[PDB]
From Swiss-Prot, chain A:
Changing L24D: No complex assembly. This is Secretin GspD. Involved in a type II secretion system (T2SS, formerly general secretion pathway, GSP) for the export of proteins. Required for secretion of cholera toxin through the outer membrane. This subunit forms the outer membrane channel. Forms a cylindrical channel with 15 subunits; unlike E.coli no 16-subunit channels are seen. The closed pentadeacameric channels are 195 Angstroms long and 145 Angstroms in diameter. Each subunit turns in a clock-wise manner around the channel. It comes from Vibrio cholerae serotype O1 (strain ATCC 39315 / El Tor Inaba N16961). The record marks A3 as: May serve as a pivot that allows opening of the central gate for substrate egress. Changing I40E: No complex assembly. The N0, N1, N2 and N3 domains are periplasmic, while the secretin and S domains form a channel that is partially inserted in the outer membrane. The cap gate extends out on the extracellular side of the channel partially closing the channel. The secretin domain forms a double beta-barrel structure; the outer barrel has an outer diameter of about 110 Angstroms while the inner barrel forms the central gate with a small pore in the closed state. It is found in: Cell outer membrane. The lineage of its organism: Bacteria, Pseudomonadati, Pseudomonadota, Gammaproteobacteria, Vibrionales.
Length: 40, 48
């Protein structure tokens, strides 16, 4: 995750932090040679 | 007649020196140990 969280108001107004940025969640498994399978 | 111990894992015998001849023969006959059969196998899945 690369992100910066700006303040968010979902309501004197309430603010909720959420993150905007680049996130990459990957779960590779390798064919016993070469090709890689990616759940991304 | 016949004995053995599996403390020692040894045939004991009661009887003839003919029983000693033939039952040293069977002392020797089933001493053999089976070669490993690969009873279990670890398989590397390529994809699934």
């Amino acid at each position: 995750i690369v992100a910066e969280e700006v303040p968010v108001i979902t309501g004197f107004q309430t603010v909720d932090r959420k993150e905007v940025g680049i996130k990459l969640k990957v779960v590779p498994q390798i064919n016993e040679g070469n090709s890689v399978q990616l759940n991304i | 007649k016949f004995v053995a111990d599996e403390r020692t894992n040894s045939i004991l015998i009661s009887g003839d020196p003919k029983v000693r001849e033939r039952l040293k023969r069977l002392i020797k006959q089933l001493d053999v140990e089976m070669a490993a059969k690969g009873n279990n196998r670890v398989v590397y899945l390529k994809y699934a």
